[PDB]
Amino acid sequence: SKMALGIKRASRSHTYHRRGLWAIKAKHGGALPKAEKPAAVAEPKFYPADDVKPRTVSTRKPHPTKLRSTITPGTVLILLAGRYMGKRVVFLKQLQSGLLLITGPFKINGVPIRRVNQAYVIATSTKVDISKVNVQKFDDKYFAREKKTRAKKTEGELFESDKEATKNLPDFKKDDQKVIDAELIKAIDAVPDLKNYLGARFSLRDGDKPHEMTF
Amino acid sequence: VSGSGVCAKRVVVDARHHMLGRLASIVAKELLNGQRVVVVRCEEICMSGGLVRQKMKYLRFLRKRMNTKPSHGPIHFRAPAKILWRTIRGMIPHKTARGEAALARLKAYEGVPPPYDRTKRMVIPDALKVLRLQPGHRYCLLGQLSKEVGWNYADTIRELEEKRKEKAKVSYDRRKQLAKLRVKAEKAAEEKLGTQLEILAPIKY
Amino acid sequence: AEQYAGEYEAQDKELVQLKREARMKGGFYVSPEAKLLFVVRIRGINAMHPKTKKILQLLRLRQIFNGVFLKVNKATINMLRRVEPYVAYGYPNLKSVRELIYKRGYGKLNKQRIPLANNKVIEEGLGKHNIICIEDLVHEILTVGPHFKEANNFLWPFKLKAPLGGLKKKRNHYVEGGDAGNRENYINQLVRRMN
Amino acid sequence: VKGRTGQRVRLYVRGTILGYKRSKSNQYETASLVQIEGVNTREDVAWYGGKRMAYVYKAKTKSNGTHYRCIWGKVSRPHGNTGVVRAKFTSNLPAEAMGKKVRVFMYPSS
Amino acid sequence: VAFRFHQYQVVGRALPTPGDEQPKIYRMKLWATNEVRAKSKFWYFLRKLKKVKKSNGQMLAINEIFEKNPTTIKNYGIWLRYQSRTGYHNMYKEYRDTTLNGAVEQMYTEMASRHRVRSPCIQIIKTATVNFKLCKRDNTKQFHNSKIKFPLVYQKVRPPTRKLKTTYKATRPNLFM
Amino acid sequence: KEKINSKRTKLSAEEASKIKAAGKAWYQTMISDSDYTEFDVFSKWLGV
RNA sequence: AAAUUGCCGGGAGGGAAGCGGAUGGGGGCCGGCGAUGCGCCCCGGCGCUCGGGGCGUGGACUGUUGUCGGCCGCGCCGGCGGCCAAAGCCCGGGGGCUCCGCGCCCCCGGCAGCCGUCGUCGGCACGGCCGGUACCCGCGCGCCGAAAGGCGUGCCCCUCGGGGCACUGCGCUGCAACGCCCUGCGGGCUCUCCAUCCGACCCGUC
RNA sequence: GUAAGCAGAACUGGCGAUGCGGGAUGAACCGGAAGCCGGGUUACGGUGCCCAACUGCGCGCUAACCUAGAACCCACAAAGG
RNA sequence: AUCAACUAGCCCCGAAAAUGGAUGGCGCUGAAGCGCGCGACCCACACCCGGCCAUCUGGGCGAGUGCCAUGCCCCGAUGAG
Ligand SMILES: [Mg+2]
Ligand SMILES: [Mg+2]
Ligand SMILES: [Mg+2]
Ligand SMILES: [Mg+2]
Ligand SMILES: [Mg+2]
Ligand SMILES: [Mg+2]
Ligand SMILES: [Mg+2]
Ligand SMILES: [Mg+2]
Ligand SMILES: [Mg+2]
Ligand SMILES: [Mg+2]
Ligand SMILES: [Mg+2]
Ligand SMILES: [Mg+2]
DSSP states (O other), rough: HHHHHHHHHHOOOHHHHHTTTTTTTTSSSTTTTOOOOOOTOOSSSSOOSSSOOOOOOOOOOOOOOOOOOOOOOTTOBBBOTTTHHHHHOOEEOOOTTTEEEEOOOOTTTSSSEEEEEEGOOOSSSSSEEEEEEEEOOOOOHHHHHOOOOOTOOOOOTTHHHHHHHHOSSSSHHHHHHHHHHHHHHHHHSTTTTTHHHHHOOOOOOOSTTTTTOOO | OOOHHHOOOOEEEEEETBOOHHHHHHHHHHHHHHHOEEEEOGGGGGEEEEEEEEEHHHHHHHHHHOOOOOOEEEEOOOSSSHHHHHHHHHSSSSHHHHHHHHHTEEEOOOOOOOSSSSSSSOOOOBBBBEEEOOOOSOEEEEEHHHHHHHHHTTHHHHHHHHHHHHHHHHHHHHHHHHHHHHHHHHHHHHHHHSSGGGGSSOOOO | HHHHHHHHHHHHHHHHHHEEEEEEEESOOOOOSSEEEEEEOOSSSOOHHHHHHHHHHHHTSSSSSEEEEOOOOOOHHHHTSHHHHGEEEEEOOHHHHHHHHHHHOOEEEEEHHHOSSSSHHHHSSSSSTOOOHHHHHHHHHHTTOOTHHHHHHHHHHHEEEOTOOOOOOOOGGGGGGGSSSEEHHHHHHHTTOOO | OOOOOOSSOOOEEEEEEEEEESSSOOOEEEEEEEEEETSTTTTTTTTTTTOEEEEEEEEEEEEETTEEEEEEEEEEEEEETTTEEEEEESSSOOOOOTTTTTEOOOSOOO | OHHHHHHEEEEEEEEOOOSSSSOEEEEEEESSHHHHHHHHHHHHHHHHHHHHOOEEEEEEEEEEEEOOOSSSEEEEEEEEEEEETTTTEEEEEEESSSSSHHHHHHHHHHHHHHSOOOOGGEEEEEEEEEETSSSSOOHHTTOSSOOOOOOSSSSOOOOOOOOGGGSBBSOOOOOOO | OOOOOOOOOOOOOHHHHHHHHHHHHHHHHHOOOOOOOOOOOHHHHHHH
16 A cells, blocks of 8 residues: 555645644644744854855654564574574564564573664564563663774784683673573473574575575 | 586586487586586497488598698597597687686596496486487487497497496495395384374375 | 546447447447557668658657657558558557656657656646646547647657567568557557557 | 584575676676576576675785685576576676686575 | 467448448458457458458458357368469368367468468468368378377476476486386 | 445346347357358369 | 896796786785864863863764665566457257267357456565755654654545545755774775786778 | 679669677678666577577477588579489 | 379489588587477667766846856757768
């Protein structure tokens, strides 16, 4: 219904409703409000020679990426790129930036609760029942890096010293993975053989055609 | 013909009873694609058109020699392996680096010289006599053609292939026995596993 | 646009009604021939007879794969008979006319070519002729109207794509297997691949 | 085979680099031709259309800690009736590149 | 499914003229590939038989005929006029096929093969169903027997679709009829 | 979807009969064949 | 200076070399080859700039993904109509054929399953190339909603679902997210050599 | 003119002055005339290998113990069996 | 069950030249020949969309916040020598 949606959105009356010009006929009496003259700073510190153009605070409000039809909270994905390729994970929930949020769990797979792009995953037809996992604590800030300054060039005394020390991933993430993998193993033992499944990794051995291979 | 695209280090061809030119085009494209091929039992390649026709074609080919220096002219080969290698070179572009690198991947033999006995010898369906020649039309074996254009090793291939066939037959009998005892093992383990093996009931034959 | 859709539908149903009526009455109804042709040129501009060159400069087919709308009258159809090995032509239907005029519609405005991406450009090029909209223009072409001369000399010779799915031989007449000449209705099945 | 060393998962479907987009007398080195192991139909490449490949080779000198180089590309569209594909690369391939093997992953997957 | 020919019937007459204000009416049964080719053949036969040209003629009706029972085999006869390289001749051809429409295809193919005669050279004078026990040709007559049985001397070995086909195969195929 | 009165009585039996008769008459005249009582030389070849 | 020659270092050579278009591998080479600054803000002195600290950001090239446009390509699906529609299926009837391909052929009438050919309306899934916004779109001026988005009044319509229309105003108006590298064994080069592929006859001239 | 890839005319187009795709090769035969690039689709001609595209789906005829035969011009075959 | 004539497809006989030799080559025989078709497919600087250069055409820019006005901006087509 892409084009029916196009017309239904495109109606002048429906655009009145959508922009909500009522409740703009509410506040300023029985009429549409005036607008005024901002920008009375009158204090330019320096005058560029080129014709000046201000910063773009972008007013375009892009649509959200559409999560694939074959993705359900609880679906066993297939990672495809990066250090966890072949790893089979379980999809927790497609988070607010658009990226998928998956888990090993780390007790069996070594794949922590981590962010994965939707492009690099192949949803399998199997599901798990996980409506009693409490995932609300995960978001973009949990994962946002605050990547540090490039003044630290990794030298012969940094190489294994970072391995040998622990100034790394924090202990609240340590405890996090414990709570999620507990409440998710309690959901995996239900599905027979699934722990062994997830323990395996998908390998496209000889005589395997992906166009033929279902998932 | 674009190739199979298969992944073997070497693919052998039991070239018994295949059309010379058809096997030659299939193999020539495999070489140009870059997959290393080895064709054996070339002494058996069947050619359409009767033996007398293939004869006169080859004896016309004998006339073609450089007048002022025969040592420089068309080099007429006799052995079936070299007949095949020339028929395939006529199909590969062999005056460029790509084409000569292609022919570097071809190795053609009469018989099956070791280590090509203990191996699976793959036949190319698009070229077999049964599938490309109507039964009852003239054909000749490149072994007979060379035996009559003067390749003096038809006998010496023949004793060696009699020896190789008997040495293969004894080992095939041994593998029959080993496979019937593997089959009794097949059923012995199946009867020892019950519901452990239900999942393979619908996808087995 | 409402009453154009209405009358198109009425004409299409009415033809069926008269054909059944004539059959039940015993004889048969003979459809009233097409008033309009779509003509698209299918040969390059090299090695042409000069008469043919002038005829194609008047039919406005001055480059391979141009497609123009033509009235059927005796002068025009005997002008097509002269350049027949060079053209492919027939009787466009409603979808053909509308989607050509939308998807490939350009206007000879001030001798300049304007992409009719809005109703406005009609208002300047036409409108002295009581054509205000793209649907007015489509109608007044398809049901060949009194102002069809002006509503067609307004249009620019449609630039078509090369025929997807290929083509047959362009050297023979369609009857002999080729592409030139009448394909009376099949110019419909062709415009979908020239567009 | 058993008790082997090498890669432990194949997440890519191997193929040969086949030539270029050629007429009978031209090359357009921009679009290469690629054969995938296992595709035998023009509509079987429908599922590969878009999936990304890598030409992996190795030069004479170390760079960034390796001899290995890799030039990236992707399956644009089908070519012919037997599942040969046309591949578009960031840089056009070497002509020694044809006959060698190229890796077709499934990354940009659907 | 699709048929390369279709048996139309075309009905036409000369243009109205002051005398003979209802010119007489001609019907024909023509094979062609579509409408416009059937029409163009109709004017051919009414300009070499009835002295009427497309300019000085008018076409009133064209119907596409179809077949009664596509499910049953019908022994067809075709009486046909054709042009050899050095003259003209007249042939009679008996076919077994489920439709006259397929029989015409088979007949153009036979004239293009047995005699290198193309379509522009062939005319179908009369077509009819010559039911069994009255057929003339031996190759038609030899399928008029229940309790018929014959094995398949010619059977292409071929994978069911283009996917399942590879270039090397271990085993020489087992062919048996 | 649930088998409502989807297209019901639209025309009566006398009309649906005469329409079928007119159609079959046109079919008879549309597949009608020639007499061939003209060509006295190719009678035996044409069968009539 | 050039043609020409020697040594030194490198490169390549199966009956020419040279040239053009691709990149690939070698070299030689480029730091304007590629950034570290902007606002707020707290002193401590010299509202304005520098010295310290907190503060959100921010740079060449390159990669990926997303979302809108544009053009395009490919695949699958559903409805409608025309056609005498035809057909098998379900029932009924109607003729010749005489031992026959014989439980043979042909035709006509009823009915309420799917099934050609053109025409046409619609749904979607996939991909390829280009663009990325001063207007077309879009955003704020209200609330709810992290968010796609929803939310009002009055008329017309069928009246379930729900749909159509409506009064319209000010201003603003360069799409995003995350990366990789940063004096490097890096980046890429229009310079050099070489290999491979395609092209490729020796210029002036009657 | 016996004819000529000959000599002289009529209508038009081409080459000359013009690249490019096809006819293996060719100034004028077939397609088609162009700024420099990215994307799509075609014309002529093709899909066994050289060589990009099917050893595709069909039906017939030919069996050549002469170099069977295999492209508009075009690189011929005749009378006759 | 058959006898004779006529006819026309492919093949054959007719059919001979000198450097070794040319359906372009190899080869091809339910063809990879011949005749007719069907689905796709491959291929030009040709057709379409898009970017850019230039030529041409047609417009905009002063009680000037005003400009290499010989400039800038917009529209359209075209590009062989
Ligand atoms: Mg040479
Ligand atoms: Mg296509
Ligand atoms: Mg064509
Ligand atoms: Mg010097
Ligand atoms: Mg030296
Ligand atoms: Mg060079
Ligand atoms: Mg370089
Ligand atoms: Mg898009
Ligand atoms: Mg002179
Ligand atoms: Mg292109
Ligand atoms: Mg090829
Ligand atoms: Mg000017």
